[PDB]
Write a protein that binds this ligand. Structure first.
Ligand SMILES: [Sb+3]
Lengths: 310, 310, 310, 310, 310
């Protein structure tokens, strides 16, 4: 039983993030618990302040006509309990609920460990025989406590796109709003545990330049390459199957190379030292002690810049 | 209280994918949230446009007779909320819901990392004392936003099989429809992280051809073989127990061999170099430096072609 | 309000497997979705065909008296929706529901990778002041689509034990039926990934017979034993704590030995080659090159036969 | 509307285990499905046998006053369906339900792989204005089929503590009962898979006593120590964070030591064999070939006895 | 229908922990099952003791007006069943429920294995046209059995913040309370399994100071470094992505270094022993046998103190 308007009835929206959590990078989802504030002139139940009762009359959802506000990008039926329904005299209804639903916002891992994200909550609403436009009321949209959590992410700002997008979806215009959660990752735990340790092995790898023992130069370059995989695997796991290239997926791959050519070298510092030509061998090995680290620091300044600087 | 027809009452269906996600390869399932659009002539509640009310009359599900449309291949009771029920004058009912259920579609890992899939949604409907045929209305079946997600898969097309299949299931014909979601995997993250790294170790493995040290030739071929298993395990994990052979399950197995005979060789470059016959040894070892890589690139072109080319 | 019989009211049962899946070996459970067909003479609501209405009258569950059919071996309250209730003239009721419940059938891993299983569904029913016998109607018991899934198992036959077992449970006879799902495992993925690779290492292990280097004979027999554990671990994991012996638990254990005595040998090919008695050492080592593989192929023919052949 | 007694109304309880399963060692819980039998004199609905109806009158739960019997140690609301309610003439009510709830009983891993447990089910009941004492009726308490499962545990006996404990909990005495499930673990799968394999490596470890190669003595003692961890990890995983010491946690830790001092020795059989004093070295190494295995079998008889013998 | 007060109606709260469990460090949540006790003067249903019925009148929730007490930091709708509602004469209502909900309290891993935590439960309550203040009644707040579990944590005290915090949230003051659960971890299983074993390898690592074999000095320092990662990985897994530094994340990282410079040394005890200057080499190697262990015990006393002592 919808409110007999004379034009498209506006519905005023607003989300108050109460909790944020379980941002699942693999899954590309996160869970939010928050307030949903709605309002509208249903002149149909205006009510003679003085003439009866009091300032504002409290209804149960069965009584009033209420607008169906479905969240767009959610796994399941949004799981909300109702808090208060308070109809003003002029027929103005005041609705508040407290949902908890896991949202399906996408993320851009193009800078992986050093990436900033922009999450989305949605809210369409289909029309019947009056048109429905939704729109935000910014006093119930300052939704974000001073407690918003979201483990391992710094949260930058909860804001929203004022102008809705109105579709025509199956011979009935709907109206969709865009609630925006900006977050930067707390890269860091990534250095002491991945970036650094992954670098350290790479160096030890090429300790085997100042060495002439093939036995201990493979027991060297090779023993480390193994352990690199154990990082490539560690990382490739807590991350999804991107169709593009990660930053750390780059430097983690660019690494693979400086092990191959490391191995190349020790390998040939030998079919060139057993070929009685240690003239050369100890010339090459002497060289790699510079070639490698430089082209690395060079290729990192090349790579690094290729991702952030552009 | 079903609609007194004069023949098999047609029910018009239609799914609008709103969300796609959590495609579980191990499980052979995926979760979808989407619109379900139904319609039918229940001439029984036709209604004198002019004579009363308005263009179309809105009912609650309790009032009207509504067709039971169960999804066939679903783990649990499909989890749907109703959106709108709008009966036209001629007795034509307009139904719309927004379900979220995890579907059990099978997948063919015969090309694993480079595989395209065709997912299914179903919708039977049992007859009572009128027969029920279901069928698709293609304006509520363009179901797929420009946001359909499905992480790590490119989505090719959401379409459907117009002609239903009508069974006789327990002395009551049912009618089943076939909704088709075509997807190709975003192979790629598979290279920098599996294909390539898995190749690199194989090479270093057989660096130990240009070597005469047994100590460092096993510390070589063997140290890498280990690391191969650590890939075979990595891969065998995020994949199910196929009764057939995978592509990467092939090349990952074909790999096992070039390590065995690598080991064979270094092993015999020794009971043949200690047997004072380095004549031969340094003949064999010299050979494997070609035999191996070739028979590999050969067996890959043989294998690769055996899977894609046929 | 139960049907006033003159003797034990028979209830006619019948299950139509619609879906099978998530057979959990560790858990010893599996999930099934399927039809449950019941029937009984409640002469109490017979109904004058001609005199009123039609052929058969449709009731809702609240109206009729319906027999409580609880599934015996289930984790939780069986999760079923009702499909149709159709009372015949003579007072014969026709009931059909579509449950989805996870069953707790035990399995016998005595042949692990090569094992056939017999799963169970149950259905007791307690008596009140008439006795209740249950029994199967085999036209609603041909329950098994041509789609029954059950990943990684071949399904042999869904059948049922006609003669129920009638208990006396707490001063009230109940009646239990036995629905049987026979399945064989798709052993196979077990070879290319476990059986074979697990064998291959065992062989390389004892390459160190044709070797005199202790350094590379331990770097040999030992480096493989490690990798065996990595299989014993892989397998012991996707399997439960049996109080008896598995097949593969056998050959996986029998394996442990041929590494110990392998190690024994290389170990003594040395305190016997450094003791200037290479007379003996190169006699023993020469021997093991036969002793081992034979006693293995022998102990496998012994073991294998001890499990399947008996 | 509770029964107007003249003293504390006794309620007669009784549990019939139908199923047992998913005993979760990490979680310290297990799931049970079983019958719950209750009874009491509600003289208030006594009923003139001859004067009307029959022997016993069947009620629905809404009609009668029924005692709230909550299970004490359960994760969630016990999940039960009702089976039969049968009021005797003298006002004696006969109640039966069939719940399935996961119980939170603690376990004592002090003898881990060889441990016997005693599980608990509870049943309090709060008083109102008559006091409620609960108590067991041992004919509905022989609850345990000849099918009770509980994978990987032998089940010894389902019994119960006749005398309830009556509390005063918040100005209202409650009454709690103690249902006891005694189980012994099927240790065994623990030997062929853990105990034994974990021993075998320890031996090979100290094959490196009959060796003089440091290269192959570390490639020895060390290669095995790794593999021990892989057991310590395997075990530490399918087990909780005990504040006390396990048996196998002991012997698994006592093991760590015989590797350290093994390493200590090989290590010093060298800074003592390169120090031209092979006099000593080959005296120590000669010794450890007895010292170790003995002090182990000794420290095991010491340890083993310290756990079971006391 | 809320109670016509003359000022802000106080609601008296109180939680009785019945169960605690599944504290998820990664997730930063834990599950609790407990009593929730509420009360308030609804003078509106005062009731003439003598004049009718008895001492106190029992209602069902539909009858009375009951305050909506939502838990603040919870994943989902708190899952509670009602136990008793008992209105006193003066209009004083007595409410009791038994909820089971998983709470989202944060944790501070800054001392990881040796850390004490303070968990939170919340309970807001929104006002309508009377204001609502909540507040604790400490006789239903002694909530904690002598059975509170919480595996692997010692539980210190369940207490609560008497003075609520009253917000203005969306033109309606709410009132929030703070229930505090203090727990210390049972560090320990962390030693025999992590701390110790992680140390032991580090030592063996630098056995390779009393060695001159490069072959067995890399087969030494390197073989252990690998095994360290296998701890860094073990630990990094059962812990979340902190934006700060852990204790064990420190010492686990500080460890990485003493392997690098260990490797540095053995590496240079060689390009300095092959450079015919064993003068120096056996001077350095001689040194590291003190430098290392000291700077470690020093850097641990430095580190350890940097975390606990400050
Ligand atoms: Sb190794």
């Amino acid at each position: 039983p919808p409110p007999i308007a004379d034009e498209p009835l506006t519905v005023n929206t607003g989300i108050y993030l109460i909790e944020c959590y379980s941002l699942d990078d693999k899954a590309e989802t996160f869970k939010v618990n928050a307030f949903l504030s709605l309002s509208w002139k249903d002149r149909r139940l205006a009510f003679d302040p003085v003439r009866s009762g009091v300032r504002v009359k409290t209804y149960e959802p069965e009584a009033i006509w209420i607008p169906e506000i479905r969240f767009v990008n959610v796994e399941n039926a949004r799981d909300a309990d109702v808090v208060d329904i308070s109809v003003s005299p002029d027929g103005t209804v005041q609705y508040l609920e407290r949902f908890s639903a896991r949202v399906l916002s996408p993320l851009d891992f193009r800078r992986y460990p050093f990436d900033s994200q922009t999450l989305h909550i949605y809210l369409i609403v289909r029309s019947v025989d009056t048109r429905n436009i939704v729109l935000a009321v910014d006093l119930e949209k300052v939704g974000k406590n001073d407690d918003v959590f979201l483990t391992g992410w710094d949260i930058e700002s909860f804001t929203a796109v004022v102008k809705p997008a109105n579709f025509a979806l199956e011979d009935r215009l709907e109206s969709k709003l865009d609630y925006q959660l900006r977050i930067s990752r707390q890269y860091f735990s990534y250095i002491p545990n991945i970036i650094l340790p992954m670098l350290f092995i790479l160096f030890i790898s090429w300790t085997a330049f100042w060495s002439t023992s093939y036995e201990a130069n493979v027991t060297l370059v090779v023993s480390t390459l193994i352990a690199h995989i154990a990082f490539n695997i560690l990382v490739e796991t807590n991350l999804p199957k991107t169709p593009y290239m990660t930053y750390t997926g780059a430097i983690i791959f660019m690494i693979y190379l400086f092990y191959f050519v490391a191995v190349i070298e020790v390998t040939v510092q030998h079919y060139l030292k057993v070929e009685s030509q240690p003239a050369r061998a100890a010339s090459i090995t002497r060289a790699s002690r510079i070639a490698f680290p430089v082209v690395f620091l060079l290729a990192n300044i090349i790579l690094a810049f290729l991702f952030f600087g552009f």
